[PDB]
Design a protein around this ligand. Structure first.
Ligand SMILES: CCCCCCCCCCCCO[C@@H]1O[C@H](CO)[C@@H](O[C@H]2O[C@H](CO)[C@@H](O)[C@H](O)[C@H]2O)[C@H](O)[C@H]1O
Ligand SMILES: CCCCCCCCCC[N+](C)(C)[O-]
Ligand SMILES: CCCCCCCCCCCC
Ligand SMILES: CCCCCCCCCCCC
Ligand SMILES: CCCCCCCCCCCC
Ligand SMILES: CCCCCCCCCC
Ligand SMILES: CCCCCC
Ligand SMILES: CCCCCC
Lengths: 48, 48, 48, 49
């Protein structure tokens, strides 16, 4: 399979630039946070 | 929030450059390092 | 001392021009020719 | 060690660039002053009658 891939080269350079553009796309759209807000078996209710 | 913020590209830029240099020392080549460093997107795409 | 043991030898071996046997820069023209003649002369004075 | 880096000039260059990057980055975020703390520390008790 790889023996065949190494005769192609140029086809797989395009696949790579697609993967990079795909990666670059997903990274920008994926929202960022710091640390997940975890359930800790407790919480409080303020009455004011 | 006011005292600095987002020094991540700054630090991951020099992280790439030090990885490049270390590989350059490993192979004794300014070019062969790229054959390793191009796999970075292959992992990131699946995570994303 | 680390630079003189690591980098300086690497630079001397790669990016330093070959000096022909006998040449002490006396053959050079302009100021440096005079300085090399003066210094090689003063080196003989000093040793004697 | 010198013989090692005569044959491996890129390795020799890599050590030099990392030291310079490490230094340059450290230099930017160092404090600036005329002197360090050279004067000995002093405590004062202030009372009033
Ligand atoms: C699933 C993730 C999707 C992203 C892409 C992942 C990479 C693709 C998966 C590996 C598949 C490679 O499959 C491999 O392809 C090459 C051609 O490219 C074939 O190679 C064939 O064609 C080439 C030229 O066209 C000939 O020189 C070669 O002698 C012939 O055998 C191999 O016989 C095949 O086994
Ligand atoms: C700033 C310190 C740099 C470390 C240099 C590492 C030297 C490796 C050379 C090994 N050897 C002696 C066998 O040549
Ligand atoms: C910080 C810049 C590093 C420069 C490295 C150059 C390596 C080539 C050596 C000279 C060859 C004749
Ligand atoms: C730096 C060059 C040293 C030159 C020394 C010259 C001394 C010559 C004096 C002879 C007196 C007997
Ligand atoms: C990139 C060049 C770094 C060397 C210069 C260091 C200067 C430090 C200035 C102090 C800023 C607070
Ligand atoms: C061939 C040109 C010679 C130049 C002489 C350099 C100046 C001498 C300084 C004492
Ligand atoms: C810092 C001293 C190095 C000695 C290596 C021979
Ligand atoms: C040859 C090893 C020397 C180590 C310098 C810290």
């Amino acid at each position: 399979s790889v023996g065949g891939i190494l005769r192609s080269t140029g086809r797989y350079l395009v696949l790579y630039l697609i993967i990079v553009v795909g990666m670059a796309y997903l990274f920008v759209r994926l929202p960022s946070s710091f640390l997940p807000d975890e359930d800790q078996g407790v919480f409080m209710t303020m009455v004011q | 929030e006011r005292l600095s913020g987002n020094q991540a590209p700054s630090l991951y830029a020099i992280s790439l450059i030090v990885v490049f240099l270390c590989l350059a020392a490993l192979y004794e080549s300014w070019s062969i390092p790229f054959s390793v460093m191009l796999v970075v997107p292959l992992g990131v795409i699946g995570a994303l | 001392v680390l630079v003189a043991l690591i980098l300086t030898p690497a630079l001397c071996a790669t990016m330093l021009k070959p000096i022909a046997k006998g040449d002490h820069g006396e053959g050079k023209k302009g100021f440096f020719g005079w300085f090399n003649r003066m210094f090689e002369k003063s080196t003989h004075h000093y040793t004697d | 060690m010198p013989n090692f880096f005569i044959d491996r000039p890129i390795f020799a260059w890599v050590i030099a660039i990392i030291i310079m990057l490490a230094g340059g980055l450290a230099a930017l975020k160092l404090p600036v002053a005329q002197y360090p703390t050279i004067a000995p520390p002093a405590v004062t008790i202030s009372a009033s009658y």
